[PDB]
């Protein structure tokens, strides 16, 4: 039978060193009573203002409400994808930053100060680890945290908790996982805020650790008290799995990460829209969208971007409507991207019109199809999906506030849209032409 180790065990110190050295822990002592205070009320103020939400994720081909309440503070315009769910940052004061709520923006700025501290301490440790022992900028980058994700769980009004399967560690707030979508070998710093035998103490919160693939090696259970911080360094998050073992009391955690956001920033997706729209004759913003090229490469590029802004951004955003609760930082940008998206509906319709046009040689028409077909296919599947997901039984479980908006959405009676929401008629017709 699988077993686990805690500080009570003799072998614990030895196991931590030879099979888990890139895991670091810094107890509350290592953090000022000054910093402890504001962070926990930055925590609390954020909480009774109702900023944290359970997410309606997807894992193992099934829609699931997350027991843990989440919110993503971080750089302006940054996103972080979490189980096919793009979380958008509630923004933190950054140099040359602007503006939303007074009480709430206070907390944000805090978790930033928090972020700064953790950053320093991660560099020390990554220095010490390299000095433990034989570039200096790879270290600085792997600690360059751009977001934190906040987590809450009251175990006592959410008393529906799984048993840990491999080492009898007890109840799990969060089952064994690798944190996704981070920069390679980049660190993770967690601040743990708990409010107030034969193995691990069940009333006290623990982070657990196992080696991937490996339920034979005794796992590690790390007791976290009020204000304890741990640190996953370098390749730890890749080689090891971790889980959260629930206590009895509530608990918060600020988990600072370096998200790979090379395609997950506002500037990134805006620039993408601009590249799509280079193929548009852009004298005037009207409904007579006309294109500069019909070269196959340019057309697929446009329609792939069409898809990117629609499903990675718009549908992801409005699935989780009801952000405007924390800060209206994304309100304008989402409007801007909806407009950009709409214009590309025009582009699509424009291309469709062109494919049916009289004086066009089939070989040039057959070439155009093959360029846009998969992208229009892929648009059909994910449209069906996005709002299957957006009206399922556990989507109608609604508090009035929390409804999963399916946006954008329109139907036939809508002559403000150049195209139908369902493209099966079109994708059919286009495919029959290609097998003629």
Ligand X SMILES: O=C(O)/C=C/C(=O)NNC(=O)c1cccnc1
Give the residue numbers of the binding site for Fe cation: 177, 179, 242
Question: Least distance from C-beta 190 to Ni ion, angstroms?
Answer: 8
Map tokens 């570039």 to a residue: 135
Binding to ligand X in span 323-342, by CB under 6 A: none
* Contact between 190 and ligand X per CB under 6 A: yes
* Contact between 255 and ligand X per CB under 6 A: yes
Q: Of Ni ion, ligand X, none, which one sits near residue 334, judging by CB under 5 to 8 A according to partner kind?
A: none
3-class DSSP state of 25: strand
* Contact between 148 and ligand X per CB under 6 A: no
Q: What CA–CA distance (Å, rounded) separates 342 from 286? A: 11
Interface residue with ligand X among 38, 109, 179, 304 (CB under 6 A) is 179
DSSP one-letter string for 73-129: EESTTBEEESSS-EEEPEE---TT-----HHHHHHHHHHHHHHHHHHHHHHHHHHHH
User: Which residues are known binding-site members for 2-oxoglutarate?
Assistant: 151, 230, 251-253, 255, 257
CA distances from 36 to 31, 47, 49, 91 (A): 7, 17, 20, 21
The residues facing 254 across adjacent strands are 150, 191
Q: Could you list the beta-strand ranges (E) of 195-310.
A: 206-211, 219-223, 228-232, 240-245, 251-257
* Contact between 162 and ligand X per CB under 6 A: no
Q: Of Ni ion, ligand X, none, which one sits near residue 87, judging by CB under 5 to 8 A according to partner kind?
A: none
Q: What CA–CA distance (Å, rounded) separates 54 from 221? A: 26
174 or 276: CB nearest Ni ion: 174
Q: Of ligand X, Ni ion, none, which one sits near residue 190, judging by CB under 5 to 8 A according to partner kind?
A: ligand X
Interface residue with ligand X among 89, 151, 194, 279 (CB under 6 A) is 151
Cα–Cα–Cα angle for 136, 266, 328, rounded to 5 degrees: 115
CB contact at 8 A, 373 and 331 = no
**Contact stretch for ligand X (CB under 6 A) within 10-18, 174-182, 214-222, 319-327:** 174-182
The residues facing 147 across adjacent strands are 74, 257
Burial of 317 (0-12, 13-18, 19+ CB in 10 A): buried
Q: What CA–CA distance (Å, rounded) separates 297 from 94? A: 39
**Contact stretch for ligand X (CB under 6 A) within 175-183, 344-352, 367-375, 383-391:** 175-183
What residue is closest to ligand X based on CB? 253
Q: Of ligand X, Ni ion, none, which one sits near residue 354, judging by CB under 5 to 8 A according to partner kind?
A: none
110 or 148: CB nearest ligand X: 148
**Which residues contact Ni ion (rule: CB under 5 A)?**
149, 179, 255
Question: Least distance from C-beta 364 to ligand X, angstroms?
Answer: 46
CA distances from 315 to 12, 78, 309, 408 (A): 47, 17, 9, 7
User: Which residues are known binding-site members for substrate?
Assistant: 70, 82, 177-180
227 or 346: CB nearest ligand X: 227
147 or 350: CB nearest Ni ion: 147
Q: What CA–CA distance (Å, rounded) separates 11 from 135? A: 35
Burial 351-387 (b: 16+ CB within 10 A, else e): bbebbeeeeeeeeebeebbebbbebbeebeebbeebb
Q: What CA–CA distance (Å, rounded) separates 310 from 301? A: 14
Interface residue with ligand X among 180, 201, 345, 354 (CB under 6 A) is 180
Binding to ligand X in span 194-253, by CB under 6 A: 207, 242, 244, 253
Question: Least distance from C-beta 418 to ligand X, angstroms?
Answer: 38
Question: Least distance from C-beta 174 to ligand X, angstroms?
Answer: 5
* Contact between 69 and ligand X per CB under 6 A: no
Tokens of 432: 């029959």
- Count residues binding ligand X (CB under 6 A): 14
Q: Of Ni ion, ligand X, none, which one sits near residue 192, judging by CB under 5 to 8 A according to partner kind?
A: ligand X
Interface residue with ligand X among 20, 82, 92, 318 (CB under 6 A) is 82
Question: Least distance from C-beta 99 to ligand X, angstroms?
Answer: 29
Q: Residues 397, 400, 403, 409: what is their CA dihedral angle, to the nearest 10 degrees?
A: 130
192 or 301: CB nearest Ni ion: 192
Question: Least distance from C-beta 147 to ligand X, angstroms?
Answer: 12
**Contact stretch for ligand X (CB under 6 A) within 1-9, 139-147, 177-185, 356-364:** 177-185
**Would you tell me which residues interact with ligand X (CB under 6 A)?**
82-83, 151, 174, 177, 179-180, 190, 192, 207, 242, 244, 253, 255
């Amino acid at each position: 039978r699988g077993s686990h180790m805690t500080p009570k065990d003799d072998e614990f110190y030895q196991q931590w060193q030879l099979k888990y050295p890139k895991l670091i822990l810094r107890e509350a002592s290592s953090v000022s009573e000054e910093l402890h205070k504001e962070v926990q009320e930055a925590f609390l103020t954020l909480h009774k203002h109702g900023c944290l939400f359970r997410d309606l994720v997807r894992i193992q081909g099934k829609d699931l409400l997350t027991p843990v309440s989440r919110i993503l503070i971080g750089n302006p315009g940054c996103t972080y994808k979490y189980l096919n769910t793009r979380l958008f940052t509630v923004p933190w004061p950054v140099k040359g930053s602007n503006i939303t709520e007074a009480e709430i923006a206070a907390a944000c700025e805090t978790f930033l100060k928090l972020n700064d501290y953790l950053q320093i301490e991660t560099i020390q440790a990554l220095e010490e680890l390299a000095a433990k022992e034989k570039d200096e900028v790879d270290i600085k980058s792997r600690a360059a945290y751009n977001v934190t994700l906040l987590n809450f769980m009251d175990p006592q009004k959410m008393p529906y908790l799984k048993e840990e399967p491999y080492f009898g560690m007890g109840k799990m707030a969060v089952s064994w996982h690798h944190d996704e979508n981070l920069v390679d070998r980049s660190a993770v710093a967690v601040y743990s805020y708990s409010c107030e035998l034969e193995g691990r103490d069940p009333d006290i919160w623990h982070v657990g650790f196992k080696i991937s693939w490996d339920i034979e090696t005794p796992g590690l259970a790390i007791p976290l008290h009020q204000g304890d911080c741990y640190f996953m360094l370098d390749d730890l998050n890749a080689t090891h799995q971790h889980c959260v073992l629930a206590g009895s009391q509530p608990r918060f955690s600020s988990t600072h990460r370096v998200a790979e956001c090379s395609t997950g920033t506002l500037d990134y997706i805006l620039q993408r829209c601009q590249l799509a729209l280079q193929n548009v004759c852009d004298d005037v913003d009207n409904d007579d969208v006309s294109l500069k090229s019909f070269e196959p490469a340019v057309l697929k590029q446009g329609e792939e971007i069409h898809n990117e802004v629609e499903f990675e951004w718009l549908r992801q955003f409005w699935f989780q409507g009801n952000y405007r609760k924390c800060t209206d930082w994304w309100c304008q940008p989402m409007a801007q991207l909806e407009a950009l998206w709409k214009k590309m509906e025009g582009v699509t319709n424009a291309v469709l019109h062109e494919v049916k046009r009289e004086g066009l040689p089939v070989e040039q028409r057959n070439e155009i199809l093959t360029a846009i077909l998969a992208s229009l296919t892929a648009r059909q599947n994910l449209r069906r999906e996005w709002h299957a997901r957006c009206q399922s039984r556990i989507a109608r479980t609604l508090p009035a506030d929390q409804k999963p908006e399916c946006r954008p959405y329109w139907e036939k009676d809508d002559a403000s849209m150049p195209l139908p929401f369902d493209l099966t008629d079109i994708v059919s017709e286009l495919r029959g032409q290609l097998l003629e």
